[PDB]
Design a protein around this motif. Sequence first.
Motif, mmCIF file in Angstrom:
data_model
loop_
_atom_site.group_PDB
_atom_site.id
_atom_site.type_symbol
_atom_site.label_atom_id
_atom_site.label_comp_id
_atom_site.label_asym_id
_atom_site.label_seq_id
_atom_site.Cartn_x
_atom_site.Cartn_y
_atom_site.Cartn_z
ATOM 1 N N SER A 132 -11.300 1.149 4.807
ATOM 2 C CA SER A 132 -9.869 0.749 4.701
ATOM 3 C C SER A 132 -9.443 1.092 3.273
ATOM 4 O O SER A 132 -9.720 0.365 2.345
ATOM 5 N N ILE A 133 -8.823 2.215 3.070
ATOM 6 C CA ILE A 133 -8.451 2.600 1.676
ATOM 7 C C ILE A 133 -7.238 1.788 1.182
ATOM 8 O O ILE A 133 -6.371 1.436 1.956
ATOM 9 N N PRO A 134 -7.149 1.529 -0.106
ATOM 10 C CA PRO A 134 -5.996 0.783 -0.700
ATOM 11 C C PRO A 134 -4.767 1.690 -0.848
ATOM 12 O O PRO A 134 -4.854 2.890 -0.688
ATOM 13 N N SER A 135 -3.628 1.137 -1.155
ATOM 14 C CA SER A 135 -2.419 1.994 -1.309
ATOM 15 C C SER A 135 -2.666 3.010 -2.423
ATOM 16 O O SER A 135 -3.354 2.742 -3.389
ATOM 17 N N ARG A 136 -2.114 4.178 -2.285
ATOM 18 C CA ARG A 136 -2.316 5.230 -3.324
ATOM 19 C C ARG A 136 -1.913 4.687 -4.698
ATOM 20 O O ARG A 136 -2.538 4.985 -5.694
ATOM 21 N N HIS A 185 -13.048 -9.342 -8.312
ATOM 22 C CA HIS A 185 -11.611 -9.529 -7.906
ATOM 23 C C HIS A 185 -10.835 -8.200 -7.895
ATOM 24 O O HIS A 185 -9.994 -7.961 -7.055
ATOM 25 N N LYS A 186 -11.079 -7.355 -8.861
ATOM 26 C CA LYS A 186 -10.370 -6.046 -8.918
ATOM 27 C C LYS A 186 -10.523 -5.328 -7.572
ATOM 28 O O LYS A 186 -9.647 -4.645 -7.095
ATOM 29 N N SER A 187 -11.695 -5.408 -6.986
ATOM 30 C CA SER A 187 -11.931 -4.704 -5.687
ATOM 31 C C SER A 187 -11.129 -5.416 -4.592
ATOM 32 O O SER A 187 -10.913 -6.613 -4.640
ATOM 33 N N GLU A 188 -10.703 -4.697 -3.592
ATOM 34 C CA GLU A 188 -9.935 -5.332 -2.479
ATOM 35 C C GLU A 188 -10.216 -4.560 -1.185
ATOM 36 O O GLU A 188 -9.553 -4.749 -0.192
ATOM 37 N N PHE A 189 -11.189 -3.676 -1.191
ATOM 38 C CA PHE A 189 -11.494 -2.893 0.053
ATOM 39 C C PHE A 189 -12.954 -2.419 0.038
ATOM 40 O O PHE A 189 -13.784 -2.954 -0.665
ATOM 41 N N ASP A 190 -13.285 -1.426 0.827
ATOM 42 C CA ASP A 190 -14.699 -0.954 0.852
ATOM 43 C C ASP A 190 -15.072 -0.341 -0.506
ATOM 44 O O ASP A 190 -14.504 0.648 -0.935
ATOM 45 N N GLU A 200 -8.676 10.404 2.982
ATOM 46 C CA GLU A 200 -8.302 9.719 4.253
ATOM 47 C C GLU A 200 -9.183 10.265 5.380
ATOM 48 O O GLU A 200 -9.667 9.521 6.212
ATOM 49 N N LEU A 201 -9.438 11.547 5.390
ATOM 50 C CA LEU A 201 -10.336 12.119 6.438
ATOM 51 C C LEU A 201 -11.713 11.470 6.303
ATOM 52 O O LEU A 201 -12.358 11.151 7.281
ATOM 53 N N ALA A 202 -12.166 11.269 5.091
ATOM 54 C CA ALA A 202 -13.498 10.632 4.881
ATOM 55 C C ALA A 202 -13.464 9.192 5.402
ATOM 56 O O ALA A 202 -14.394 8.723 6.029
ATOM 57 N N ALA A 203 -12.392 8.490 5.151
ATOM 58 C CA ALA A 203 -12.277 7.082 5.631
ATOM 59 C C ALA A 203 -12.392 7.043 7.155
ATOM 60 O O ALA A 203 -12.935 6.115 7.714
ATOM 61 N N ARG A 204 -11.882 8.027 7.846
ATOM 62 C CA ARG A 204 -11.984 7.995 9.333
ATOM 63 C C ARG A 204 -13.460 8.067 9.730
ATOM 64 O O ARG A 204 -13.900 7.388 10.636
#
Length: 75
Positions: free
Chosen positions: A45-49, A4-9, A36-40
């Motif tokens: 889909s990174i979570p909010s900072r 549950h703690k996880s919410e993205f990749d 963010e460059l790595a996510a591209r």
Amino acid sequence: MNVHKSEFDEDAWQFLIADYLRPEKPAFRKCYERLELAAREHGWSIPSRATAFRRIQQLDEAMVVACREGEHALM
């Protein structure tokens, strides 16, 4: 079944955690931009900072030693 703690990749979160634990000690505000460059490249889909740092706090203050555990060696 992701926790549950996880919410993205999960793979993207591991990348960020691996860098924080490195003896380099990247800047959280600037290092996040590099992520963010790595996510591209991986399309993560990174979570909010805010969510990331809040999650880092659950690691515990001892996690700070995990980042500073850097072993010294020169002789």
